[PDB]
Amino acid sequence: PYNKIVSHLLVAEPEKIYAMPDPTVPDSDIKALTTLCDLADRELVVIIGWAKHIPGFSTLSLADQMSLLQSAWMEILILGVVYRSLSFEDELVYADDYIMDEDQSKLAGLLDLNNAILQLVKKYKSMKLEKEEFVTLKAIALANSDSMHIEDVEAVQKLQDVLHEALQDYEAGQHMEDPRRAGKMLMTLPLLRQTSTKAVQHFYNIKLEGKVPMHKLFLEMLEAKV
Amino acid sequence: PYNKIVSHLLVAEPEKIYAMPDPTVPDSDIKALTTLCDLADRELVVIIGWAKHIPGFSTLSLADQMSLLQSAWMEILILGVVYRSLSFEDELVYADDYIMDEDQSKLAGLLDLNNAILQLVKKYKSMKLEKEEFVTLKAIALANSDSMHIEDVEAVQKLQDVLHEALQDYEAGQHMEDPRRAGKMLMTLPLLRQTSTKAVQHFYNIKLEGKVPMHKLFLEMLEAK
Amino acid sequence: HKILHRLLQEG
Amino acid sequence: HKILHRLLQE
């Protein structure tokens, strides 16, 4: 009944992606990490194709489209993990075929990072984050990436406003009970930014340790000067 | 003629502070760093006093009060530096008596961090940030600290709603020509959060280094887990 | 930044 | 966690 943009972001939402961990390979920290890094690489391919559907995004310069994605890709990834995990408890649904509980995490040396992601999960759980709000938030995070190297500053600000308006539209027509819901949603972006840069740093260290293999795209995003 | 909370926060704004660099010492990074680290420690005693005046804050438990501060103190410090630099250009007013420029920064070993803090400045300048919005945003950042050691989540969540509602009411009265003004202010919190953790980790690198002297509080906040 | 540029330009 | 405790405690 509400926003055309929100409806459009709902249709553009990608189909499920799977982790596909090798049933034959025995479990270990490298199996898990190699798995997560493979899932991420494929995810990124999808994410980039998705961004083109965000209204006004593909009209920016190629350099700008790249700067936004280079700065927000991990936030878009984390948001997806968070949303898929709303219906669970103390577990992170990286994919339908790869759900990590506490132990699984400790063994992969990802306890701290995942606990951070669970902080996010907890907040959205209490707010009862709806799919419509989820897709709009992803687009907003991408647009509000805070990249240093932006060309057309005004065009990016306009993009942020367009998406921000769609979020207001949804919250006013669908959540009259809480006139402050849009703001509460926006107030969750900071923790998303925090957790994301932390995740990006952790996987860069894994990259340097060289014990875990990663594909070119996932590597390229980690490398990127952001 | 606006909001009570907003008025309360305007009045509660701390008294201006001074770096008071030492004339006897020759300009150097260790001097610059020792200065900022000296200022910050003093500003922190100020902030702790100020926090107790944020409507509802003292209401929380000491434990919670502490958690928020050990989590958001650097964001508060930076917001002050940011607001003060609004009238200037490509400069950071860490204090009236201590303004840094591009060269001073790099020579202080902080051109990348200060270049980021100026990112915030640029954003706030293009929005025409007002003192009313600045004091409210500063309180929101503290209440929306995302500390993982909180005890009464609901209580803190209430502190947030009060402050957020004040910001919304204010914007609805003074800036009706822009229905999204309040939201744009909140959307600046991420960059503040990012810049703030960057700065903290960096000054932690110094503390661990030991070439710069620091005072008991500043350090306490830095070892603060 | 070549893969990103490529996947984006493709459309 | 002491100093901060003291100041806030006033």
CSV table of C-alpha atoms in Angstrom, one decimal:
chain,number,residue,atom,x,y,z
A,1,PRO,CA,0.0,0.0,0.0
A,2,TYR,CA,3.0,2.2,0.7
A,3,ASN,CA,6.3,3.0,-1.0
A,4,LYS,CA,7.0,2.1,-4.6
A,5,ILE,CA,10.7,2.0,-3.8
A,6,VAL,CA,10.2,-0.4,-0.9
A,7,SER,CA,8.0,-2.6,-3.2
A,8,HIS,CA,10.8,-2.4,-5.8
A,9,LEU,CA,13.5,-3.4,-3.3
A,10,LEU,CA,11.3,-6.3,-2.2
A,11,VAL,CA,11.2,-7.7,-5.8
A,12,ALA,CA,14.9,-7.1,-6.4
A,13,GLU,CA,15.9,-9.0,-3.2
A,14,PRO,CA,18.1,-11.8,-4.4
A,15,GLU,CA,17.3,-15.5,-4.1
A,16,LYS,CA,18.9,-17.7,-1.3
A,17,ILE,CA,22.6,-18.4,-1.6
A,18,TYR,CA,24.2,-21.5,-0.1
A,19,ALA,CA,27.5,-22.1,1.8
A,20,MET,CA,27.9,-25.7,0.4
A,21,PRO,CA,30.5,-26.9,2.9
A,22,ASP,CA,32.2,-30.1,1.7
A,23,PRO,CA,30.6,-33.0,3.6
A,24,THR,CA,33.7,-35.1,2.9
A,25,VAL,CA,36.2,-32.7,4.3
A,26,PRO,CA,36.6,-33.1,8.1
A,27,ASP,CA,35.6,-30.1,10.2
A,28,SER,CA,38.2,-27.6,11.3
A,29,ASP,CA,38.9,-23.9,11.5
A,30,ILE,CA,40.1,-23.8,7.9
A,31,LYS,CA,37.1,-25.7,6.5
A,32,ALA,CA,34.8,-23.2,8.2
A,33,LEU,CA,36.8,-20.1,7.2
A,34,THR,CA,37.4,-21.3,3.6
A,35,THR,CA,33.6,-21.9,3.5
A,36,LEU,CA,32.7,-18.5,4.8
A,37,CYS,CA,35.1,-16.8,2.4
A,38,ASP,CA,33.6,-18.8,-0.5
A,39,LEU,CA,30.1,-17.9,0.5
A,40,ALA,CA,31.2,-14.2,0.7
A,41,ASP,CA,32.7,-14.2,-2.7
A,42,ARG,CA,29.5,-15.5,-4.3
A,43,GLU,CA,27.5,-13.1,-2.2
A,44,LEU,CA,29.4,-10.1,-3.4
A,45,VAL,CA,28.7,-11.1,-7.0
A,46,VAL,CA,25.0,-11.0,-6.1
A,47,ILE,CA,25.3,-7.8,-4.1
A,48,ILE,CA,26.9,-5.9,-7.0
A,49,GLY,CA,24.1,-7.1,-9.4
A,50,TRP,CA,21.6,-6.1,-6.7
A,51,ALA,CA,22.9,-2.5,-6.2
A,52,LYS,CA,22.0,-1.8,-9.9
A,53,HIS,CA,18.3,-2.1,-8.9
A,54,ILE,CA,18.6,0.6,-6.3
A,55,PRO,CA,16.8,3.6,-7.8
A,56,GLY,CA,19.3,6.3,-8.8
A,57,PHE,CA,22.3,4.2,-8.0
A,58,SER,CA,23.3,3.1,-11.5
A,59,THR,CA,23.2,6.7,-12.7
A,60,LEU,CA,26.2,7.7,-10.5
A,61,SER,CA,29.6,7.5,-12.1
A,62,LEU,CA,31.3,4.1,-12.3
A,63,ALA,CA,33.9,5.4,-9.9
A,64,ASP,CA,31.2,6.5,-7.4
A,65,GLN,CA,29.3,3.2,-7.7
A,66,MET,CA,32.5,1.5,-6.9
A,67,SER,CA,33.4,3.7,-3.9
A,68,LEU,CA,30.0,3.1,-2.3
A,69,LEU,CA,30.2,-0.7,-2.7
A,70,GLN,CA,33.9,-0.7,-1.7
A,71,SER,CA,32.9,1.0,1.6
A,72,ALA,CA,29.7,-0.8,2.4
A,73,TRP,CA,30.0,-4.4,1.1
A,74,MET,CA,30.6,-5.9,4.5
A,75,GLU,CA,27.6,-4.0,6.0
A,76,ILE,CA,25.4,-5.4,3.3
A,77,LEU,CA,26.7,-8.9,4.0
A,78,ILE,CA,26.3,-8.6,7.8
A,79,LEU,CA,22.8,-7.2,7.5
A,80,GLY,CA,21.8,-10.3,5.5
A,81,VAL,CA,23.3,-12.6,8.1
A,82,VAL,CA,21.5,-10.7,10.8
A,83,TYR,CA,18.1,-10.7,9.1
A,84,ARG,CA,18.3,-14.5,8.4
A,85,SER,CA,19.0,-15.0,12.1
A,86,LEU,CA,16.1,-13.1,13.6
A,87,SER,CA,14.1,-16.3,14.2
A,88,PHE,CA,16.9,-18.1,15.9
A,89,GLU,CA,18.6,-17.9,19.3
A,90,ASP,CA,22.4,-17.4,19.8
A,91,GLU,CA,23.0,-18.7,16.3
A,92,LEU,CA,24.0,-17.0,13.1
A,93,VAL,CA,22.5,-18.0,9.8
A,94,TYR,CA,25.2,-17.3,7.3
A,95,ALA,CA,23.1,-19.5,5.0
A,96,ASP,CA,20.3,-22.1,5.3
A,97,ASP,CA,23.1,-24.7,5.0
A,98,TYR,CA,25.5,-23.1,7.4
A,99,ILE,CA,24.2,-22.0,10.8
A,100,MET,CA,26.8,-21.2,13.5
A,101,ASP,CA,26.2,-21.7,17.2
A,102,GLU,CA,28.7,-20.6,19.9
A,103,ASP,CA,31.0,-23.7,19.6
A,104,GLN,CA,31.1,-23.7,15.8
A,105,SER,CA,32.3,-20.1,16.2
A,106,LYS,CA,34.9,-20.7,18.9
A,107,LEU,CA,36.5,-23.4,16.7
A,108,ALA,CA,36.6,-21.0,13.8
A,109,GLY,CA,38.2,-18.3,16.0
A,110,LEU,CA,35.1,-16.1,15.3
A,111,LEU,CA,33.6,-15.9,18.8
A,112,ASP,CA,34.1,-12.2,19.4
A,113,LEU,CA,33.0,-11.1,15.9
A,114,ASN,CA,29.9,-13.3,15.9
A,115,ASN,CA,29.0,-12.1,19.4
A,116,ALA,CA,29.1,-8.6,18.0
A,117,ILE,CA,26.8,-9.7,15.1
A,118,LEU,CA,24.5,-11.2,17.7
A,119,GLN,CA,24.4,-7.8,19.4
A,120,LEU,CA,22.9,-6.5,16.2
A,121,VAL,CA,20.5,-9.5,16.0
A,122,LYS,CA,19.4,-8.8,19.5
A,123,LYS,CA,18.5,-5.2,18.7
A,124,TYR,CA,16.5,-6.0,15.6
A,125,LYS,CA,14.8,-8.9,17.4
A,126,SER,CA,13.5,-6.5,20.0
A,127,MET,CA,12.3,-4.1,17.3
A,128,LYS,CA,10.8,-6.9,15.3
A,129,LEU,CA,12.6,-5.9,12.1
A,130,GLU,CA,10.4,-6.5,9.1
A,131,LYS,CA,11.6,-7.6,5.6
A,132,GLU,CA,10.5,-4.2,4.2
A,133,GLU,CA,12.6,-2.4,6.7
A,134,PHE,CA,15.5,-4.8,6.1
A,135,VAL,CA,15.8,-4.2,2.4
A,136,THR,CA,15.5,-0.5,2.7
A,137,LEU,CA,18.1,-0.4,5.4
A,138,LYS,CA,20.6,-2.3,3.2
A,139,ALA,CA,20.1,0.3,0.4
A,140,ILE,CA,20.5,3.1,3.0
A,141,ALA,CA,23.7,1.6,4.5
A,142,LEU,CA,25.2,1.4,0.9
A,143,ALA,CA,24.2,5.0,0.2
A,144,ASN,CA,25.4,6.3,3.6
A,145,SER,CA,28.8,4.4,3.3
A,146,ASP,CA,30.8,7.5,4.1
A,147,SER,CA,33.4,6.9,1.4
A,148,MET,CA,36.2,9.4,1.3
A,149,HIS,CA,36.7,9.3,-2.4
A,150,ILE,CA,33.2,10.4,-3.6
A,151,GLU,CA,32.9,12.4,-6.9
A,152,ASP,CA,29.4,13.8,-7.1
A,153,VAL,CA,28.7,14.5,-3.3
A,154,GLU,CA,25.3,16.0,-4.1
A,155,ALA,CA,24.1,13.1,-6.2
A,156,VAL,CA,25.0,10.7,-3.3
A,157,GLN,CA,23.2,12.9,-0.8
A,158,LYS,CA,20.2,12.9,-3.1
A,159,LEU,CA,20.3,9.1,-3.2
A,160,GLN,CA,20.4,9.0,0.6
A,161,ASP,CA,17.4,11.3,0.8
A,162,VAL,CA,15.3,9.3,-1.7
A,163,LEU,CA,15.8,6.0,0.3
A,164,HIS,CA,15.4,7.8,3.6
A,165,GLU,CA,12.0,9.1,2.4
A,166,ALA,CA,11.0,5.6,1.3
A,167,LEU,CA,11.7,4.4,4.9
A,168,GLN,CA,9.6,7.3,6.3
A,169,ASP,CA,6.8,6.4,4.0
A,170,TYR,CA,6.8,2.8,5.1
A,171,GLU,CA,7.0,3.6,8.8
A,172,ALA,CA,4.2,6.2,8.7
A,173,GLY,CA,1.7,4.1,6.7
A,174,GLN,CA,2.6,0.8,8.4
A,175,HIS,CA,3.6,1.8,12.0
A,176,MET,CA,1.5,4.7,13.2
A,177,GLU,CA,1.8,3.2,16.7
A,178,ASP,CA,5.5,4.4,16.8
A,179,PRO,CA,6.1,7.8,15.2
A,180,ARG,CA,9.8,7.4,16.0
A,181,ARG,CA,10.4,4.0,14.4
A,182,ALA,CA,12.2,5.3,11.3
A,183,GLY,CA,14.7,7.1,13.7
A,184,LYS,CA,15.1,3.9,15.8
A,185,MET,CA,16.0,2.1,12.6
A,186,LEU,CA,18.5,4.7,11.6
A,187,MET,CA,20.0,4.6,15.1
A,188,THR,CA,21.1,1.0,14.5
A,189,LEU,CA,23.4,1.9,11.5
A,190,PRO,CA,26.3,2.9,13.9
A,191,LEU,CA,26.5,-0.6,15.4
A,192,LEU,CA,26.3,-2.0,11.9
A,193,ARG,CA,29.2,0.2,10.8
A,194,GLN,CA,31.2,-0.8,13.9
A,195,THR,CA,30.7,-4.5,13.5
A,196,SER,CA,31.4,-4.3,9.8
A,197,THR,CA,34.8,-2.6,9.9
A,198,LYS,CA,35.7,-5.1,12.7
A,199,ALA,CA,34.7,-8.0,10.4
A,200,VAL,CA,36.6,-6.6,7.5
A,201,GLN,CA,39.7,-6.2,9.6
A,202,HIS,CA,39.5,-9.8,11.0
A,203,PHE,CA,39.3,-11.3,7.5
A,204,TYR,CA,42.2,-9.2,6.3
A,205,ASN,CA,44.3,-10.8,9.0
A,206,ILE,CA,43.2,-14.2,7.8
A,207,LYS,CA,44.2,-13.1,4.4
A,208,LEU,CA,47.7,-12.1,5.6
A,209,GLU,CA,48.1,-15.3,7.6
A,210,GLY,CA,47.7,-17.0,4.2
A,211,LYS,CA,46.5,-20.3,5.6
A,212,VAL,CA,43.0,-19.8,4.2
A,213,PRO,CA,42.3,-19.7,0.4
A,214,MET,CA,40.0,-17.0,-1.0
A,215,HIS,CA,38.7,-16.0,-4.4
A,216,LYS,CA,39.7,-12.9,-6.4
A,217,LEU,CA,36.5,-10.8,-5.7
A,218,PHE,CA,36.4,-11.3,-2.0
A,219,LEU,CA,40.1,-10.5,-1.9
A,220,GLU,CA,39.7,-7.4,-4.1
A,221,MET,CA,37.1,-6.0,-1.6
A,222,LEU,CA,39.4,-6.7,1.4
A,223,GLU,CA,42.3,-5.1,-0.5
A,224,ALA,CA,40.4,-1.9,-1.6
A,225,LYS,CA,41.8,1.3,0.0
A,226,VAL,CA,38.8,2.3,2.1
B,1,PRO,CA,10.6,28.6,22.6
B,2,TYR,CA,11.2,24.9,21.8
B,3,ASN,CA,11.8,21.7,23.7
B,4,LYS,CA,12.6,21.3,27.5
B,5,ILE,CA,15.3,18.7,27.0
B,6,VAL,CA,16.9,20.8,24.3
B,7,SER,CA,16.9,23.9,26.5
B,8,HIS,CA,18.3,21.8,29.4
B,9,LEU,CA,21.2,20.6,27.2
B,10,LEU,CA,22.0,24.0,25.9
B,11,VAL,CA,22.4,25.3,29.5
B,12,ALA,CA,24.3,22.2,30.6
B,13,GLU,CA,27.1,22.7,27.9
B,14,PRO,CA,30.5,22.6,29.7
B,15,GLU,CA,32.7,25.7,30.0
B,16,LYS,CA,35.3,26.2,27.2
B,17,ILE,CA,38.6,24.6,27.8
B,18,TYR,CA,42.3,25.3,27.0
B,19,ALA,CA,45.2,23.3,25.8
B,20,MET,CA,47.8,25.7,27.3
B,21,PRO,CA,50.8,24.3,25.3
B,22,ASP,CA,54.1,24.8,27.1
B,23,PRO,CA,56.2,27.7,25.8
B,24,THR,CA,59.4,26.2,27.2
B,25,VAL,CA,59.2,23.1,25.0
B,26,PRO,CA,60.0,23.2,21.3
B,27,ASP,CA,57.2,22.2,18.9
B,28,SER,CA,57.3,18.4,18.3
B,29,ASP,CA,55.0,15.5,17.9
B,30,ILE,CA,55.6,14.2,21.4
B,31,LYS,CA,54.7,17.8,22.6
B,32,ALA,CA,51.6,17.9,20.4
B,33,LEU,CA,50.5,14.4,21.4
B,34,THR,CA,51.3,15.1,25.1
B,35,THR,CA,49.2,18.3,24.7
B,36,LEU,CA,46.1,16.7,23.2
B,37,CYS,CA,46.4,13.8,25.7
B,38,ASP,CA,46.6,16.4,28.5
B,39,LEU,CA,43.6,18.4,27.2
B,40,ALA,CA,41.5,15.3,26.7
B,41,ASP,CA,42.1,14.1,30.3
B,42,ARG,CA,40.8,17.4,31.6
B,43,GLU,CA,37.9,17.5,29.1
B,44,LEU,CA,37.0,14.0,30.4
B,45,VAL,CA,36.5,15.3,34.0
B,46,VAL,CA,34.3,17.9,32.3
B,47,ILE,CA,32.3,15.3,30.3
B,48,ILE,CA,31.7,13.1,33.3
B,49,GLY,CA,30.2,16.2,35.1
B,50,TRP,CA,28.1,17.0,32.0
B,51,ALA,CA,26.8,13.5,31.6
B,52,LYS,CA,25.3,13.6,35.1
B,53,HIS,CA,23.3,16.6,33.8
B,54,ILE,CA,21.8,14.8,30.8
B,55,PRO,CA,18.1,14.4,31.6
B,56,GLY,CA,17.6,10.8,32.8
B,57,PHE,CA,21.2,9.7,32.8
B,58,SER,CA,21.9,9.9,36.5
B,59,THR,CA,18.7,7.9,36.8
B,60,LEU,CA,20.6,4.8,35.4
B,61,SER,CA,22.8,2.7,37.6
B,62,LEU,CA,26.4,3.7,38.2
B,63,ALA,CA,27.4,0.5,36.3
B,64,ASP,CA,25.4,1.5,33.2
B,65,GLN,CA,26.5,5.1,33.5
B,66,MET,CA,30.1,3.9,33.4
B,67,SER,CA,29.6,1.5,30.5
B,68,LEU,CA,28.1,4.2,28.3
B,69,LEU,CA,30.9,6.6,29.0
B,70,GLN,CA,33.8,4.1,28.6
B,71,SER,CA,32.1,3.3,25.3
B,72,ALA,CA,31.2,6.8,24.0
B,73,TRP,CA,33.7,9.2,25.6
B,74,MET,CA,35.8,9.5,22.4
B,75,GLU,CA,32.7,10.3,20.3
B,76,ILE,CA,31.8,13.1,22.6
B,77,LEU,CA,35.4,14.5,22.5
B,78,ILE,CA,35.4,14.4,18.8
B,79,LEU,CA,31.9,16.0,18.4
B,80,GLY,CA,33.2,19.0,20.4
B,81,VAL,CA,36.3,19.4,18.2
B,82,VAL,CA,33.9,19.1,15.2
B,83,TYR,CA,31.4,21.6,16.3
B,84,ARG,CA,34.2,24.1,17.1
B,85,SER,CA,35.7,23.7,13.7
B,86,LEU,CA,32.5,24.6,11.9
B,87,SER,CA,33.4,28.3,11.2
B,88,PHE,CA,36.9,27.4,10.0
B,89,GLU,CA,38.2,25.7,6.9
B,90,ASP,CA,40.3,22.6,6.6
B,91,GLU,CA,41.3,23.2,10.2
B,92,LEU,CA,40.5,21.5,13.6
B,93,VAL,CA,39.9,23.6,16.6
B,94,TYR,CA,40.9,21.2,19.4
B,95,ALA,CA,40.8,24.3,21.6
B,96,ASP,CA,40.7,28.0,21.0
B,97,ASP,CA,44.4,28.2,21.9
B,98,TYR,CA,45.3,25.1,19.9
B,99,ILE,CA,44.1,24.9,16.2
B,100,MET,CA,45.6,22.3,13.9
B,101,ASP,CA,46.0,22.5,10.1
B,102,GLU,CA,47.1,20.0,7.5
B,103,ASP,CA,50.8,20.4,8.2
B,104,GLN,CA,50.5,20.5,12.0
B,105,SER,CA,48.5,17.2,11.8
B,106,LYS,CA,50.9,15.2,9.6
B,107,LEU,CA,53.8,16.5,11.7
B,108,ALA,CA,51.8,15.3,14.7
B,109,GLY,CA,51.3,12.0,13.0
B,110,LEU,CA,47.5,12.4,12.6
B,111,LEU,CA,46.7,13.6,9.0
B,112,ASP,CA,44.6,10.5,8.2
B,113,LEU,CA,42.5,10.6,11.4
B,114,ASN,CA,42.1,14.4,11.4
B,115,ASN,CA,41.3,14.2,7.7
B,116,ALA,CA,38.4,12.0,8.7
B,117,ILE,CA,37.2,14.2,11.6
B,118,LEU,CA,37.1,16.9,8.9
B,119,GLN,CA,34.8,14.6,6.9
B,120,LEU,CA,32.3,15.0,9.7
B,121,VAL,CA,32.9,18.8,9.7
B,122,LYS,CA,32.2,19.0,6.0
B,123,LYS,CA,28.9,17.1,6.5
B,124,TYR,CA,27.8,19.2,9.4
B,125,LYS,CA,28.8,22.4,7.6
B,126,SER,CA,26.7,21.6,4.6
B,127,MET,CA,23.8,20.9,6.9
B,128,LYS,CA,24.3,24.1,8.9
B,129,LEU,CA,24.4,22.3,12.2
B,130,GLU,CA,23.0,24.4,15.1
B,131,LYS,CA,24.1,24.3,18.7
B,132,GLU,CA,20.7,22.9,19.6
B,133,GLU,CA,21.2,20.0,17.3
B,134,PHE,CA,24.8,19.6,18.4
B,135,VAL,CA,24.1,19.3,22.1
B,136,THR,CA,21.2,16.9,21.5
B,137,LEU,CA,23.2,14.8,19.1
B,138,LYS,CA,26.0,14.5,21.6
B,139,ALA,CA,23.7,13.2,24.2
B,140,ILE,CA,22.1,10.7,21.7
B,141,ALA,CA,25.6,9.4,20.9
B,142,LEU,CA,26.2,8.7,24.6
B,143,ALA,CA,22.9,7.0,25.1
B,144,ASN,CA,23.2,5.1,21.8
B,145,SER,CA,26.8,3.9,22.7
B,146,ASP,CA,26.1,0.2,22.0
B,147,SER,CA,28.0,-0.9,25.1
B,148,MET,CA,27.9,-4.7,25.5
B,149,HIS,CA,28.2,-4.5,29.3
B,150,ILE,CA,24.8,-2.8,30.0
B,151,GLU,CA,22.7,-4.2,32.9
B,152,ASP,CA,19.3,-2.6,32.4
B,153,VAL,CA,18.8,-2.5,28.6
B,154,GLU,CA,15.3,-1.2,29.0
B,155,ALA,CA,16.4,1.8,31.2
B,156,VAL,CA,19.0,2.8,28.6
B,157,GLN,CA,16.6,2.2,25.8
B,158,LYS,CA,14.3,4.7,27.6
B,159,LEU,CA,17.1,7.3,27.8
B,160,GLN,CA,17.5,7.0,24.1
B,161,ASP,CA,13.8,7.5,23.4
B,162,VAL,CA,13.7,10.7,25.5
B,163,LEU,CA,16.7,12.2,23.7
B,164,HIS,CA,15.5,11.0,20.3
B,165,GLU,CA,12.0,12.4,20.9
B,166,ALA,CA,13.6,15.7,21.8
B,167,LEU,CA,15.6,15.8,18.6
B,168,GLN,CA,12.4,14.9,16.6
B,169,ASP,CA,10.3,17.5,18.3
B,170,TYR,CA,12.9,20.2,17.9
B,171,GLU,CA,13.3,19.4,14.2
B,172,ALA,CA,9.5,19.3,13.7
B,173,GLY,CA,9.2,22.8,15.2
B,174,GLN,CA,12.3,24.7,13.8
B,175,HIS,CA,12.8,22.9,10.5
B,176,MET,CA,9.4,22.0,9.2
B,177,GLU,CA,10.7,22.8,5.6
B,178,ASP,CA,12.6,19.6,5.8
B,179,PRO,CA,10.7,16.6,7.1
B,180,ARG,CA,13.8,14.5,7.1
B,181,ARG,CA,16.2,16.8,9.0
B,182,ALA,CA,16.1,14.8,12.2
B,183,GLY,CA,16.9,11.6,10.2
B,184,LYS,CA,19.9,13.2,8.4
B,185,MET,CA,21.3,14.2,11.8
B,186,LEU,CA,21.0,10.6,13.0
B,187,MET,CA,22.6,9.3,9.8
B,188,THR,CA,25.8,11.1,10.7
B,189,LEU,CA,26.2,8.9,13.9
B,190,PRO,CA,27.8,6.1,11.9
B,191,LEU,CA,30.8,8.2,10.7
B,192,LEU,CA,31.1,9.5,14.2
B,193,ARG,CA,31.2,6.0,15.5
B,194,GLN,CA,33.8,4.9,13.0
B,195,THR,CA,36.1,7.9,13.4
B,196,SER,CA,35.8,7.5,17.1
B,197,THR,CA,37.0,3.9,17.3
B,198,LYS,CA,39.8,4.7,14.9
B,199,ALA,CA,41.1,7.5,17.1
B,200,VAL,CA,40.9,5.4,20.3
B,201,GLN,CA,42.8,2.4,18.9
B,202,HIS,CA,45.5,4.8,17.6
B,203,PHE,CA,46.0,6.6,21.0
B,204,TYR,CA,46.1,3.1,22.5
B,205,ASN,CA,49.1,2.4,20.2
B,206,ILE,CA,50.8,5.4,21.8
B,207,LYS,CA,50.0,4.4,25.4
B,208,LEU,CA,51.5,1.0,24.7
B,209,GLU,CA,54.4,2.8,23.0
B,210,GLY,CA,55.2,4.9,26.1
B,211,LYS,CA,56.9,7.9,24.4
B,212,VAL,CA,54.0,10.1,25.5
B,213,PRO,CA,53.0,10.8,29.1
B,214,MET,CA,49.3,10.4,30.0
B,215,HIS,CA,47.2,11.1,33.1
B,216,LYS,CA,45.2,8.6,35.2
B,217,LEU,CA,41.7,9.2,33.8
B,218,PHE,CA,42.5,9.4,30.1
B,219,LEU,CA,44.5,6.2,30.5
B,220,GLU,CA,41.7,4.6,32.6
B,221,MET,CA,39.3,5.3,29.7
B,222,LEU,CA,41.8,3.9,27.2
B,223,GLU,CA,42.4,0.5,29.0
B,224,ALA,CA,38.7,0.5,29.5
B,225,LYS,CA,37.5,-2.7,27.8
C,1,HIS,CA,39.3,-3.0,-8.4
C,2,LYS,CA,39.1,-4.7,-11.8
C,3,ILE,CA,36.5,-7.4,-11.0
C,4,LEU,CA,34.2,-4.9,-9.4
C,5,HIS,CA,34.5,-2.5,-12.3
C,6,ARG,CA,33.8,-5.3,-14.7
C,7,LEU,CA,30.8,-6.8,-13.0
C,8,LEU,CA,29.3,-3.3,-12.7
C,9,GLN,CA,30.0,-2.1,-16.2
C,10,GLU,CA,28.5,-5.4,-17.6
C,11,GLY,CA,25.1,-3.7,-17.0
D,1,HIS,CA,37.2,1.6,36.5
D,2,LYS,CA,38.1,3.5,39.7
D,3,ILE,CA,38.5,7.2,38.8
D,4,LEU,CA,35.4,7.3,36.7
D,5,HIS,CA,33.6,5.5,39.5
D,6,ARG,CA,34.7,8.3,41.9
D,7,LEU,CA,33.7,11.2,39.7
D,8,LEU,CA,30.2,9.7,38.9
D,9,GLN,CA,29.7,8.8,42.6
D,10,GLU,CA,29.8,12.5,43.7
